Amino acid sequence: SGFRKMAFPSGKVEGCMVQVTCGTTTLNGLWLDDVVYCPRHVICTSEDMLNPNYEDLLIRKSNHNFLVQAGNVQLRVIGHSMQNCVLKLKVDTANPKTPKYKFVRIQPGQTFSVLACYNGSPSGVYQCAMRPNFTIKGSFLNGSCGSVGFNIDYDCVSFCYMHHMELPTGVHAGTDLEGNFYGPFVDRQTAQAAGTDTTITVNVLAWLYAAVINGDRWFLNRFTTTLNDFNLVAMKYNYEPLTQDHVDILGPLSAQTGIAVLDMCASLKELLQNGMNGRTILGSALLEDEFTPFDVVRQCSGV
Amino acid sequence: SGFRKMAFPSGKVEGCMVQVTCGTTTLNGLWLDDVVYCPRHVICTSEDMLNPNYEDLLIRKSNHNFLVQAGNVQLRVIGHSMQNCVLKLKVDTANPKTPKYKFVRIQPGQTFSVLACYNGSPSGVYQCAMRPNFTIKGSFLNGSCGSVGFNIDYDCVSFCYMHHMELPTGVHAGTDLEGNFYGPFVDRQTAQAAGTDTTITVNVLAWLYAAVINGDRWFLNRFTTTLNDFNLVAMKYNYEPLTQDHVDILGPLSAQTGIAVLDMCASLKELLQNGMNGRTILGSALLEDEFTPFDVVRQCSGV
Ligand SMILES: *C(=O)[C@H](C[C@@H]1CCCNC1=O)NC(=O)[C@H](CC(C)C)NC(=O)[C@H](Cc1ccccc1)NC(=O)/C=C/c1ccccc1
Ligand SMILES: *C(=O)[C@H](C[C@@H]1CCCNC1=O)NC(=O)[C@H](CC(C)C)NC(=O)[C@H](Cc1ccccc1)NC(=O)/C=C/c1ccccc1
């Protein structure tokens, strides 16, 4: 028993982290085979933060402008290119620690582990969800760029996030590993706003099932609702619409607990309209939406 | 900026996990140099559970009754001994991945990272605190015994916890790596109940400082209190007494924010007496007590 915000074991990714310096700017790089991936804004100066044209800063760079350090071993850069908002630095050594890996782009509402690093050295690991507005609520300080997000399936690391920036609201924005930003953000010093966020309804339901599996039952009731009547309540509270595919995805948790999805929806509607009246669910006084149905099944395997 | 429950990178410990089987019972072991450490209840059977004489059970075992597997490689057990509630299995191979390490026993109120494992294979990593009643609120299923808790300083792994059991309340109990239980628990079958828990006051104050560092300021006030008057309120709400050493430990966070410790205590008193009136702090509607002052400093480093 127990339910915790759990990250994937980070060992396979730790072996991929290097330090990339260009000018007086240092950040993190991801070393896979003979390529190091890093945010392209490593080539920017104090003087070009509002109007940066990145082909040219790049055209004006040479291979020797990039110092790549793996531990205390210097890697020789033998080629450089831009891929959207990331740089690909070809180095003269394939990383012997390269895991089996994939570059996947994730969907809002999906979760991943972040390995926070500074100067190529990992600091900590934690779980994040991609918000409906394509930001993430992380923990990132100056020097955290090149910190990657990932999932692991058996021995294959699916990289999904590279960190680039913090917004004025304190939330975080980045790219997939092809260098394409999540959301309407750009790698400039512009104060940018994300759109309005919403709550990931299917995840809240999954976490309620986690609660039941773990013995928290006080919020259950006889009642059931229709999908239509639930979604009318959901939109009033800034919750995302629940689709039939969401209902289907919750099937296995529904079967394990014997609580029909639309029954659990009736509990959620009451929680939304009444609050908790001083009680907690799995140690929380708020409704939690950063656990996917997969996250619950993986962790609550067998109770 | 940002504040998350963050675990240490788990790579160094992943390289130490093995699978230990004796009879029909499989659990995890910790392989350091030429010794594998595991819970001694691996040698118990279905019908000796309520009070095994472990020491009778061990004299009846031989080296070949213990099968140890590191990945896909069987390790030969060449010796076995009991140290309190753990077993030391001497193997014929020193683990080439052994980090610099220490066996430390932690205090209630301190935190550590848990690498949850099954069949010698790591599943996830998360942060735990040792409760004042010597339990931990973890996520542990059947097969997770022998999973370890640890902190990392520089590149030295300080192991502090090995998992043994779940209490009827759903919380978890284990030993240090010398096999001595945290708290009044035994690796046998009784009606084991935790003693009454309390909230870790110094940690709540540390987390309030993290909140300020991260721009959550609504709970601040212009009052200050005396340590005596605060501790009278703390005792009323099941909070641990705040000592002058606690105030001293909070010094650096006090200086960084310019909020004197006893001023922050005045905010905490009002939070305890009024609640939050529907507001949140660092995304929480409850007062969080599983971040130490060190956890905050290390993460809210330089704003
Ligand atoms: C890379 O390591 C770094 C990480 C972020 C910086 C520190 C805070 N948390 C982080 O994750 N990424 C950047 O520095 C990035 C470089 C750009 C994309 C070229 N910039 C930022 O993240 C933010 C964007 C921003 C700009 C203006 C307002 C609000 C957000 N830049 C800053 O935070 C700097 C703000 C600043 C500096 C000096 C004086 C006043 C304000
Ligand atoms: C080792 O892997 C295992 C992990 C725990 C078991 C599964 C639940 N979560 C865990 O962390 N540790 C044990 O199995 C341990 C072995 C003892 C110490 C020799 N036992 C337990 O953790 C609990 C103790 C307990 C016993 C009775 C009531 C409450 C708690 N044992 C059980 O959970 C088994 C309960 C049970 C089994 C079969 C029928 C009815 C109840």
Author numbering:
A (entry chain A), B (entry chain B): 1 to 303
Quoted passage from the original study:
Among the 29 viral proteins encoded by the SARS-CoV-2 RNA genome, the 3C-Like protease (3CLPro, otherwise known as main protease) is indispensable for coronavirus replication. SARS-CoV-2 3CLPro features a dyad catalytic center composed of the highly conserved histidine and cysteine residues (H41 and C145), which are responsible for the proteolytic processing of polyprotein precursors pp1a and pp1ab. Here, we designed and examined five new tetrapeptidomimetic anti-SARS-CoV-2 inhibitors targeting the 3C-Like protease (3CLPro), which is highly conserved among coronaviruses and essential for viral replications. The binding pocket of SARS-CoV-2 3CLPro can be subdivided into four sub-pockets (S1–S4).
We adopted a tetrapeptidomimetic scheme for the inhibitor design (denoted as tetrapeptidomimetic compounds, or TPM), similar to the backbone of 13b. Compared to 13b, the (S)-γ-lactam ring at P1 position was expanded to the (S)-δ-lactam ring for better steric fitting with the S1 pocket (H163, E166, and H172). The P1 (S)-δ-lactam ring formed hydrogen bond networks with the H163, E166, and H172 residues, while the P2 isopropyl group formed van der Waals contacts with M49 or M164. More importantly, the P3 groups penetrated into the S3/S4 groove as intended. Interestingly, the relative orders of the binding energies (TPM 10 > 1 > 5 > 16 > 19) was not the best predictor of the inhibitory activities (TPM 5 > 10 > 16 > 1 > 19). As the initial screen, TPM16 and TPM19 reduced the RNA loads of SARS-CoV-2 replicon by magnitudes of 103 (relative level to the control experiment using DMSO), comparable to the effect of remdesivir, a viral RNA polymerase inhibitor. Thus, a balance of in vitro and ex vivo effects for TPM16 (IC50 = 0.16 μM, EC50 = 2.82 μM) likely reflect a balance between binding modes, impacts on the H41 conformations, and solvation. As evaluated by computational methods, PF-07321332 induced similar kinetic features compared to TPM16, one of the best lead compounds found in the current study, suggesting the reliability of using simulated ΔGbind, RMSF, and solvation energies to guide drug discovery.
